Amino acid sequence: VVDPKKYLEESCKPKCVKPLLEYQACVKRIQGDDSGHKHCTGQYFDYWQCIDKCVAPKLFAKLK
Amino acid sequence: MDLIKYFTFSMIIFILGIWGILLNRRNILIMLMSIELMLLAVNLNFLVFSVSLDDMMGQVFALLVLTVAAAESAIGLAIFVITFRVRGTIAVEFINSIQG
Amino acid sequence: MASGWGITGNKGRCYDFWMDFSECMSHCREPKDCTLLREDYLECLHHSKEFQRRNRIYKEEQRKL
Amino acid sequence: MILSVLSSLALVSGLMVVRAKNPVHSVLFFILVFCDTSGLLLLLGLDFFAMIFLVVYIGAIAVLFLFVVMMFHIQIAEIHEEVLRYLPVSGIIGLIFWWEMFFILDNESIPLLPTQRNTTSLRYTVYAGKVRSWTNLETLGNLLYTYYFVWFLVSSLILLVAMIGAIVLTMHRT
Amino acid sequence: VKVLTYFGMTLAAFAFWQSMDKVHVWIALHQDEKQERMEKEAEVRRVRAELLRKA
Amino acid sequence: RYLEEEDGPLMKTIKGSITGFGAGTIYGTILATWKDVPRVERNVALPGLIRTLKMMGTHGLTFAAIGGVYIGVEQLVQNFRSKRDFYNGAIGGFVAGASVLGYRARSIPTAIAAGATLAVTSALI
């Protein structure tokens, strides 16, 4: 039907608002190219690291 | 920075009253004077705020608190006199009979 | 400065702002409708935002020096 | 600077009120704290309150304290205690109260930092207020007895209670 | 106390009050960082409650 | 309702021990100030200050031990068992209470009583 992990990844977003808003601000701060070397990988990792730590201890219950 | 400096003047007097309570467990007369120091600091607060806000209500209340402070001191020292007259001493060990 | 009596014998510096805020609150059933007038009155009382802005100017002057 | 001098004088004099061995000296240092307060009031332009603090606090209240304390002949043994052990508790209490209250206005009343520019030239003068100016005395007297007369009368009731209670508690008629 | 002791305690108190002046200037200089940090913490709470009500 | 943190079991234990020491220092100061001074000590100041500081340090130590061991055992329960409940923690309160307050009181029934009380208190939360 619908992926349990994907649903849980959207439902854990409130727990990770701070890494999200820092990633969102990094995206804005690099919208100008500057010869294409600026990126937001670090803020990306912090957001998904927080998201993964929220989804991990509840995903395996929805799985048989 | 004028307002902060006047305020901290009054605040130091208030803290000195608190410390004087804390530091005089054998000296109940100094405790009464510490309470008068706190009352003075409050009066200063009212006057400073009255000036800072261009409002007269702080001055009216300062005068009335003056009347109250005088009445409190008169009654307080009367009770001190009758306490001493009964006991012959002002030591705190003679005013601790009521307890439990 | 909500009473009106000034310390030099004239209308208080912040009385008109107080009266604007009060008249707004007397008929607006939501306090948020009179937020601007309320912060006008409080700004008159303490000059917080004015002094903050002037300190910004001073800080920028010190930075460019 | 001047406020720093007055604050330092008041701070030392208050410490001496709360730390003097002899209570007579304590009452005398209290007179110095009230004189310093009068100076602060003069700086704020409130000369009536500056004089009244002299008349009432020093001229009447401190005199009563002095009469009582002097006639009590307190012996230093009845009231002596070593205060070294209270440095930690005084430290914590005073530090909490300091960090919280010496800086209570800072968020609400942000200080204006002095710049290297003459801001005195932006003082706006309104001459209409200066035609017939009011003293502190008549500005207060305009309110005490008319718009706020009930509180005036309640204060009289407070004074009456003080007179009655003083007589009842201490009088021994010859 | 000795008169010199009262004078010295006054000098020390004068130094304390000048130090307090420096503290007040330091607090006044950091109003902007306080304001910017408060911007974040209030907006985090908004983005948060809005996301928590999407479900 | 709880989604404002960054956690870390070792960080949790360290911060809890530090908070315990602070609270124990405050409590020891209060207790030292409440007491009178022994009569042989009324006329000399320094031994009173030494006793106050000793009381401060001893109470800071015992409170730090409680505030550290409690959360340490709480996480070491919820880490191995890996179930989040009020049960995880009732054990930490019990072991903190028993160990520290029975080492202090030198009594086993007192250790059991203290652990039981801490268990109920942590259960309500």
Domain boundaries, chain B: 2-87
Nearest CA among C13, D113, D165 for reference residue B56:
C13
Nearest CA in chain F to A16: F3
Q: What are the angstrom distances between the C-alpha of C57 and each of C48, D110, E23?
A: 14, 15, 20
Distance between CA atoms of residues D35 and D6, nearest Å: 10
Q: What are the angstrom distances between the C-alpha of D103 and each of B18, B51, B85, D7, F61?
A: 18, 20, 45, 16, 33
| Joined tokens for residue F100 | 């520290």
For A12-54, give the DSSP string.
Answer: TGGGGHHHHHHHHHHHHHT-S-TTTT---HHHHHHHHHHHHHH
Model resolution, angstroms: 2.8
Distance between CA atoms of residues B81 and B85, nearest Å: 6
The dihedrals phi and psi of D126, each to the nearest 5 degrees, come to -110, 110
CATH number at residue D75: 1.20.120.1200
| Joined tokens for residue B25 | 């467990």
Is residue D174 assigned to a domain? no
Residue range(s) defining the domain that contains residue A62 = 1-64
Q: How many domains does chain A have?
A: 1
Q: Are F56 and D91 in contact (CB under 8 A)?
A: no
Is any Cβ of chain B less than 8 angstroms from the Cβ of C7?
A: yes
Nearest CA among C3, E10, B18, B66 for reference residue D58:
B66
Alpha helices in E1-55 (DSSP H): 3-29, 31-54
Per the CB < 8 Å rule, is F45 touching D86? no
Interface of E with A in 20-49 (CB under 8 A): 40, 43-44, 47-48
Residue range(s) defining the domain that contains residue D90 = 2-169
Chains linked to B by 3 or more Cβ pairs within 8 Å: C, D, E
Is residue D67 assigned to a domain? yes
Alpha helices in chain F (DSSP H): 9-34, 46-80, 87-105, 108-123
Q: Which letter does DSSP use for residue F38 in this model? A: P
Burial C28-45 (b: 16+ CB within 10 A, else e): eeeeeebeebbebbbebb
Q: How many domains does chain D have?
A: 1
The dihedrals phi and psi of B10, each to the nearest 5 degrees, come to -65, -40
Cβ neighbours, 10 Å, residue B41: 22
**Closest CB from E14, E24, E27 relative to D8:** E14
Q: Which letter does DSSP use for residue C13 in this model? A: T
Cβ neighbours, 10 Å, residue F28: 23
Entry field: residues in chain B: 100
Cβ neighbours, 10 Å, residue F123: 12
Distance between CA atoms of residues A21 and D83, nearest Å: 54
Q: Which among A11, A15, A46 is the top mutation candidate for probing chain F, defined by the most F β-carbons within 10 Å of its own β-carbon?
A: A15
Is residue D56 assigned to a domain? yes
Distance between CA atoms of residues A40 and A1, nearest Å: 33
Distance between CA atoms of residues C22 and C34, nearest Å: 9
Q: Which residues are within 8 A (CB) of F4 and not within 5 positions of it... i.e. 6 or more apart?
A: none
Q: Are F92 and F122 in contact (CB under 8 A)?
A: yes
Q: Which fold is adopted by the domain B2-87?
A: Helix Hairpins (1.10.287)
Is residue D27 assigned to a domain? yes
C48 burial level (CB within 10 Å; 0-12, 13-18, 19+): middle
Helix or strand run (H / E) with residue D29: helix D23-43
Nearest CA among E40, E42, E38, E35 for reference residue A21:
E40
